[PDB]
Amino acid sequence: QWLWDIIDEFIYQFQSFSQYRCKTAKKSEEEIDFLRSNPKIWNVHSVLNVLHSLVDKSNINRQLEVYTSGGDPESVAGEYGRHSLYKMLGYFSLVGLLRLHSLLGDYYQAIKVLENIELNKKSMYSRVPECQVTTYYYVGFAYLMMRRYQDAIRVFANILLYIQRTKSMFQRTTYKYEMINKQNEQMHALLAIALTMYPMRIDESIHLQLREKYGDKMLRMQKGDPQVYEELFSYSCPKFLSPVVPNYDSVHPNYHKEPFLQQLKVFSDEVQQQAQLSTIRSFLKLYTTMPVAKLAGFLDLTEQEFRIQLLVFKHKMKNLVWTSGISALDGEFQSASEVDFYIDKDMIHIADTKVARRYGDFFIRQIHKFEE
Amino acid sequence: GGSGDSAVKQVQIDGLVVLKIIKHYQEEGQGTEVVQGVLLGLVVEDRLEITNCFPFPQHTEDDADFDEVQYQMEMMRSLRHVNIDHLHVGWYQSTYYGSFVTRALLDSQFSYQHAIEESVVLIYDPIKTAQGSLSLKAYRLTPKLMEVCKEKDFSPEALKKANITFEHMFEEVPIVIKNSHLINVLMWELEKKSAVADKHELLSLASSNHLGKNLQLLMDRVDEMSQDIVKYNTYMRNTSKQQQQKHQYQQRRQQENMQRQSRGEPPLPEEDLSKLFKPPQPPARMDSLLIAGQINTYCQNIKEFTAQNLGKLFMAQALQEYNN
Amino acid sequence: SDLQQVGGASARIQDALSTVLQYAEDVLSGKVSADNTVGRFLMSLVNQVPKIVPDDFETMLNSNINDLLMVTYLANLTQSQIALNEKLVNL
């Protein structure tokens, strides 16, 4: 009673709204230009589409946790609501992007990723700042699922920094603004653990006392931990799927538990494999070129007793981390060491300091226009 | 048209006037804050033609005490006898450093603008600001500030007047954009000078190379600007902190104490309640220091902007010449 | 910018002039007054700008462009901090 009953009231409204939307919006320019001409406010339309997606996703997660096999929610949401809203025309404005943003957010939570090549190619409208942030949020998760650590971090950094020149205002963030910022931070921290040594490019998006905290953890994880991986896994899996809301703990239900067990395995096996690679990537390329004694000290570092060192060293090298030349005759192993650079971000910062002053000049002049 | 605020019109300044100012230069007292003299002109087509100027020669060395009335009176007798009359439409200064507004010159401008609405104050900033875009600046003062003149004071006057709001970053009038039709004589000179006088033109350009190799000009102007920015900002920061410690910090403890005392005595006063709250010297609104501060920081930002503009193009020219 | 346009206007006159000076020698006989005289003017230009030629010096030049850009960037930051102080005290 109450909580489930409110979900049905929302489903009844959303189905009725969908029946109205499926019915009118392919002919009704009489309805529509009456809507265009009469009001002097516009932002409500953007809020309602975002609010409906958040409420629906909150409602779907609770139903899916309680009824764990064979029930209606995914098909009824997918086939009728999401596919009809995907397949009809976009209302002139950014409304077609807003419907695509729910469809992509439902597709993301159902882990059925592939169709981004289609979605991006149909999204040729101007990315007015809010629709850039939503697109980047899903694209960073798509790159993360694709295991493209280098690409995901750049996309996550933009929305974590939040200097995307957004101008909202009118409660559009919304109700999870802090949580969305930490959701980006959590993935950015995981990406930093995989990529570091190389960036040099974390200072832009993550402030120093969090660079400190994930740096302790990253250095400990690649030297001994267990507990940092346990901490990282438990915080991250909570944010990776984006389930929006839990239900309520009790002895009697199983259900939510079957839910949680499926989520834990899928993230565990991939992250475990990636964590092992991150530890292999830990040891510094101290010199390019190794004769047999230096190679033997690297084998001693790599594993001992005894049996089988060089064989597993072939596998550990060929995971990704070592591209090299061998001479059998001279006994020397020849490799490159990867390099990276700095004073990159400052060129972006000079542009956005100019924007920041200009936005403040605009604000004072707009206030001043009421005391003329 | 060239009309601006109130009745004012855009400035047209002769090149003859610029040469007369350049003769009376910026030497025989390089460091000395001498306001150089008056500008004379007349109301014309769409604009104000500034036709003439004369200097006011004070007791100058490092010191620079003010001077006699009959110098201006005999000069304005003398000037009328050669051409027109003493139609005085502004005043001018160079003088030392790059663009700065020493505070009593704002009061001097305020007093002049209350007397004459149709007036422009001219600041000349050449090699001393690194010559150097916006080298002549012609500025008028705000009508709302002039309308409530006199005065500004320390906190009375200012608290009432500045909370009716007055603009103070204000109209700068644009100078040259068409022929004066006096160019004619100088144009006849130009084709000869050039001509067989080529030695003079070439030498004048060649002075630039000697100046540019010898002078540390970007570092030098940055050091005087850094000195200027730290002087004015440290003065403003201590001034704001002094008013804040009177506005907020005193009142906060007075309410802290008044709430402990509790604050109404029914058979007779209220003795220490009567004692509590009497104004410190700033209760609010020290605008006479603040507004003059902001005009100087705006002048400092203009110097940063002109220095940045010089650096943008120098970096481009240095990169462009080398790589081929 | 006006000076740079005057300099480019002058440089284009030099290209046209040297093209005519050479072509006068090619056509029949010319360039006698413009021989080691112009060859000293062009050298006088080249010795001053670009001064010398090697890798050490262009690397030094690019390092100075980065420092001049850093000073220019810091001047944007000072002007923005003056703006942050300005925006706090005009509300």
XYZ file of C-alpha atoms in Angstrom, chain A:
372
model
C 0.000 0.000 0.000
C 1.008 3.614 -0.835
C 4.456 3.154 -2.501
C 3.401 0.499 -5.099
C 0.026 2.205 -5.584
C 1.833 5.510 -6.503
C 3.823 3.500 -9.120
C 0.514 2.324 -10.707
C -0.817 5.946 -10.632
C 2.350 7.045 -12.495
C 2.077 4.067 -14.966
C -1.610 4.961 -15.594
C -0.579 8.599 -16.245
C 2.450 7.624 -18.430
C 0.402 5.132 -20.510
C -2.380 7.764 -20.919
C 0.209 10.433 -21.864
C 1.750 7.958 -24.364
C -1.712 7.207 -25.862
C -2.282 10.974 -26.260
C 1.251 11.512 -27.683
C 0.998 8.565 -30.114
C -2.441 9.857 -31.187
C -2.005 13.668 -31.731
C 1.568 14.462 -32.755
C 1.618 13.665 -36.511
C -1.067 16.126 -37.656
C -1.924 18.574 -34.881
C -0.267 21.843 -35.921
C -3.488 23.612 -34.754
C -2.821 22.340 -31.158
C 0.912 22.955 -31.560
C 1.011 26.567 -32.910
C -1.518 27.542 -30.225
C 1.156 26.158 -27.823
C 3.977 28.052 -29.665
C 2.299 31.507 -29.792
C 0.441 31.955 -26.454
C 2.999 31.479 -23.529
C 6.036 33.550 -22.436
C 7.846 30.650 -20.681
C 9.303 27.484 -22.266
C 11.580 25.563 -19.850
C 8.776 23.400 -18.343
C 8.683 21.153 -21.457
C 12.361 20.170 -20.989
C 11.813 19.479 -17.255
C 8.748 17.216 -17.776
C 10.524 14.884 -20.267
C 13.565 14.558 -17.911
C 11.315 14.178 -14.812
C 9.217 11.453 -16.514
C 12.398 9.484 -17.411
C 13.722 9.708 -13.812
C 10.331 8.721 -12.271
C 9.813 5.869 -14.803
C 13.353 4.524 -14.172
C 12.731 4.706 -10.386
C 9.417 2.849 -10.910
C 10.909 0.183 -13.286
C 13.805 -0.720 -10.925
C 11.421 -1.478 -8.027
C 9.150 -3.680 -10.188
C 12.147 -5.544 -11.706
C 13.733 -6.267 -8.294
C 10.444 -7.646 -6.855
C 9.427 -9.721 -9.922
C 12.679 -11.283 -11.090
C 11.655 -13.422 -14.072
C 8.999 -13.501 -16.821
C 7.083 -10.296 -15.965
C 5.812 -7.405 -18.098
C 7.991 -4.269 -17.278
C 10.945 -4.510 -19.734
C 8.820 -5.556 -22.771
C 5.924 -3.152 -22.027
C 8.372 -0.258 -21.518
C 10.541 -1.323 -24.538
C 7.996 -2.351 -27.199
C 5.220 0.170 -26.555
C 6.609 3.232 -24.731
C 10.294 3.506 -25.637
C 10.004 2.254 -29.251
C 6.932 4.445 -30.079
C 8.627 7.532 -28.575
C 11.860 6.625 -30.464
C 10.097 6.024 -33.822
C 7.915 9.192 -34.089
C 9.006 12.713 -35.176
C 10.899 15.057 -32.784
C 9.011 18.218 -31.792
C 10.866 21.243 -33.277
C 13.239 22.344 -30.495
C 15.540 19.871 -28.666
C 12.617 17.549 -27.729
C 13.794 14.776 -30.124
C 17.148 14.698 -28.278
C 15.299 14.506 -24.911
C 13.304 11.426 -26.056
C 16.558 9.879 -27.408
C 18.254 10.624 -24.032
C 15.627 8.501 -22.196
C 15.862 5.725 -24.854
C 19.677 5.690 -24.523
C 19.358 5.735 -20.670
C 16.979 2.743 -20.762
C 19.252 0.943 -23.303
C 22.252 1.607 -20.960
C 20.464 0.110 -17.904
C 19.419 -2.985 -19.907
C 23.130 -3.381 -20.966
C 22.072 -3.943 -24.618
C 24.763 -1.596 -25.994
C 25.587 -1.385 -29.747
C 23.088 1.048 -31.408
C 25.131 4.230 -30.563
C 26.372 4.251 -34.198
C 22.696 4.631 -35.223
C 21.798 7.067 -32.356
C 24.737 9.466 -32.961
C 24.084 9.523 -36.744
C 20.451 10.608 -36.177
C 21.517 13.254 -33.591
C 22.693 16.014 -35.971
C 20.924 18.865 -34.117
C 22.830 21.686 -32.304
C 24.168 20.579 -28.899
C 22.806 23.438 -26.731
C 24.744 22.925 -23.420
C 22.318 20.684 -21.442
C 22.018 18.260 -24.399
C 25.835 18.175 -24.615
C 26.098 17.139 -20.912
C 23.449 14.351 -21.275
C 25.123 13.060 -24.475
C 28.571 13.085 -22.814
C 27.227 11.248 -19.706
C 25.964 8.336 -21.836
C 28.972 8.420 -24.248
C 31.431 8.181 -21.283
C 29.545 5.130 -19.967
C 29.484 3.652 -23.520
C 33.297 4.115 -23.841
C 33.700 2.596 -20.332
C 31.578 -0.475 -21.329
C 33.641 -0.716 -24.563
C 36.801 -0.724 -22.333
C 38.152 2.463 -23.949
C 39.783 3.982 -20.850
C 41.614 6.755 -22.781
C 38.374 7.974 -24.412
C 36.041 7.558 -21.415
C 38.231 9.733 -19.122
C 38.112 12.730 -21.537
C 34.299 12.571 -21.785
C 33.872 12.072 -17.991
C 36.355 14.931 -17.272
C 34.227 17.453 -19.250
C 31.008 16.746 -17.297
C 32.854 16.313 -13.946
C 34.537 19.749 -14.419
C 31.051 20.989 -15.407
C 32.411 24.028 -17.329
C 30.286 23.105 -20.366
C 28.774 26.624 -20.375
C 25.412 25.427 -18.944
C 22.991 28.122 -17.785
C 20.432 26.273 -15.647
C 18.587 27.837 -13.586
C 14.934 26.619 -13.325
C 15.673 23.360 -11.369
C 16.819 21.208 -14.341
C 19.859 19.431 -12.769
C 17.820 17.882 -10.817
C 17.288 16.328 -7.312
C 20.473 14.166 -7.762
C 22.999 16.859 -8.836
C 25.568 15.861 -6.191
C 24.972 12.156 -6.914
C 25.452 12.633 -10.714
C 28.695 14.564 -10.036
C 29.951 11.707 -7.759
C 28.769 9.117 -10.367
C 31.100 10.819 -12.894
C 33.878 11.084 -10.218
C 33.606 7.364 -9.312
C 34.115 6.239 -12.932
C 36.854 8.892 -13.391
C 38.690 7.460 -10.337
C 38.429 3.890 -11.792
C 39.751 5.200 -15.154
C 42.599 7.029 -13.348
C 43.624 3.719 -11.642
C 43.863 2.023 -15.073
C 45.632 4.916 -16.901
C 48.063 6.470 -14.331
C 51.226 6.916 -14.818
C 50.159 8.716 -18.057
C 47.749 11.604 -16.949
C 48.896 14.550 -16.054
C 45.197 15.266 -16.816
C 43.203 14.691 -13.621
C 43.866 18.161 -12.092
C 41.236 19.756 -14.379
C 38.349 17.556 -13.191
C 39.203 16.217 -9.708
C 40.300 18.655 -6.949
C 43.562 17.926 -5.053
C 42.198 16.390 -1.825
C 40.438 13.729 -3.961
C 43.564 13.265 -6.181
C 45.340 12.552 -2.823
C 42.665 10.092 -1.637
C 42.386 8.029 -4.831
C 46.225 8.213 -5.196
C 46.801 6.455 -1.832
C 44.276 3.824 -2.908
C 45.736 3.436 -6.439
C 49.306 2.983 -5.124
C 48.133 0.515 -2.432
C 45.893 -1.460 -4.898
C 48.841 -2.052 -7.267
C 51.113 -3.086 -4.345
C 48.883 -5.284 -2.126
C 45.127 -4.580 -1.897
C 42.393 -6.451 -1.594
C 40.647 -3.752 0.526
C 40.993 -0.812 -1.919
C 39.590 -3.096 -4.672
C 36.764 -4.153 -2.253
C 36.041 -0.441 -1.451
C 36.284 0.550 -5.158
C 34.013 -2.330 -6.297
C 31.341 -1.698 -3.606
C 31.092 2.068 -4.295
C 31.363 1.688 -8.115
C 28.798 -1.069 -8.852
C 26.184 0.999 -7.003
C 26.847 3.772 -9.585
C 27.719 1.790 -12.776
C 24.204 0.509 -13.647
C 22.358 3.674 -12.468
C 19.305 1.918 -10.812
C 18.108 5.276 -9.319
C 16.419 3.891 -6.166
C 16.358 0.786 -3.861
C 13.309 -0.779 -2.131
C 13.352 -1.751 1.595
C 15.326 -4.448 3.477
C 13.550 -7.372 5.190
C 14.129 -11.083 6.006
C 11.203 -12.419 3.927
C 11.856 -11.266 0.278
C 14.515 -12.869 -1.893
C 13.989 -11.051 -5.186
C 16.073 -7.795 -4.850
C 18.834 -10.201 -3.855
C 18.700 -12.013 -7.267
C 18.986 -8.564 -8.848
C 22.049 -7.728 -6.711
C 23.744 -11.127 -7.322
C 23.506 -10.767 -11.152
C 24.898 -7.193 -10.958
C 27.850 -8.207 -8.747
C 29.080 -11.096 -10.984
C 29.018 -9.162 -14.303
C 31.003 -6.227 -12.925
C 33.346 -8.491 -10.852
C 34.783 -10.705 -13.618
C 35.573 -7.816 -16.009
C 36.969 -5.506 -13.261
C 39.088 -8.387 -11.794
C 40.713 -8.988 -15.222
C 41.287 -5.195 -15.676
C 42.684 -4.852 -12.095
C 45.259 -7.609 -12.814
C 46.313 -5.719 -15.990
C 46.585 -2.440 -13.968
C 48.985 -4.188 -11.530
C 51.069 -5.515 -14.515
C 51.130 -1.897 -15.848
C 52.462 -0.700 -12.400
C 56.223 -1.287 -12.818
C 58.148 1.650 -14.339
C 59.998 1.370 -17.673
C 63.258 2.545 -15.987
C 65.417 2.079 -19.101
C 64.572 1.201 -22.754
C 67.133 -1.496 -23.363
C 67.834 -4.642 -21.312
C 70.688 -7.197 -21.649
C 70.158 -10.626 -19.983
C 71.031 -9.617 -16.355
C 68.518 -6.700 -16.437
C 65.929 -9.062 -17.972
C 66.698 -11.586 -15.165
C 66.127 -8.851 -12.515
C 62.810 -8.088 -14.246
C 61.938 -11.850 -14.115
C 62.894 -11.894 -10.379
C 60.565 -8.906 -9.899
C 57.826 -10.592 -12.035
C 57.658 -13.961 -10.172
C 59.927 -16.464 -8.337
C 60.113 -20.245 -7.628
C 61.130 -20.853 -10.512
C 59.439 -22.411 -12.905
C 57.903 -20.811 -15.016
C 59.027 -17.067 -15.116
C 59.852 -16.509 -18.840
C 56.654 -18.280 -20.045
C 54.300 -16.105 -17.941
C 56.504 -13.081 -18.759
C 55.572 -13.673 -22.459
C 51.857 -13.574 -21.493
C 52.278 -10.560 -19.131
C 54.143 -8.642 -21.896
C 51.604 -9.573 -24.611
C 48.549 -8.422 -22.605
C 49.260 -4.928 -24.122
C 52.142 -3.456 -22.115
C 55.380 -4.360 -24.033
C 56.139 -3.769 -27.757
C 59.725 -4.796 -28.401
C 62.594 -6.230 -30.456
C 64.581 -9.326 -29.548
C 68.059 -10.364 -30.653
C 68.968 -14.007 -30.083
C 72.585 -13.311 -31.168
C 73.414 -10.233 -29.042
C 71.270 -11.218 -26.000
C 69.631 -7.788 -25.752
C 65.929 -6.934 -25.314
C 65.055 -3.607 -26.969
C 61.878 -1.649 -26.125
C 60.467 1.846 -26.147
C 59.116 3.610 -23.033
C 55.849 5.548 -23.498
C 55.827 9.331 -22.881
C 53.262 12.077 -22.224
C 53.263 15.864 -21.673
C 51.982 18.876 -19.719
C 50.884 22.577 -20.065
C 47.905 21.406 -22.133
C 44.993 22.471 -19.870
C 46.149 26.128 -19.504
C 45.263 26.766 -23.189
C 41.664 25.708 -22.374
C 41.757 27.691 -19.077
C 42.677 31.001 -20.812
C 39.523 30.631 -22.980
C 37.210 29.809 -20.025
C 38.637 32.573 -17.722
C 37.612 35.000 -20.528
C 34.104 33.394 -20.535
C 33.939 33.510 -16.687
C 34.699 37.268 -16.572
C 32.230 37.889 -19.443
C 29.411 35.926 -17.706
C 29.995 38.063 -14.575
C 29.991 41.275 -16.678
C 26.666 40.127 -18.174
C 25.143 39.345 -14.721
C 25.972 42.774 -13.155
C 24.698 44.584 -16.284
C 21.461 42.516 -16.229
C 20.884 43.413 -12.513
C 21.783 47.080 -13.318
C 19.086 47.118 -16.048
C 16.434 47.092 -13.241
C 17.758 50.341 -11.586
C 18.209 52.458 -14.741
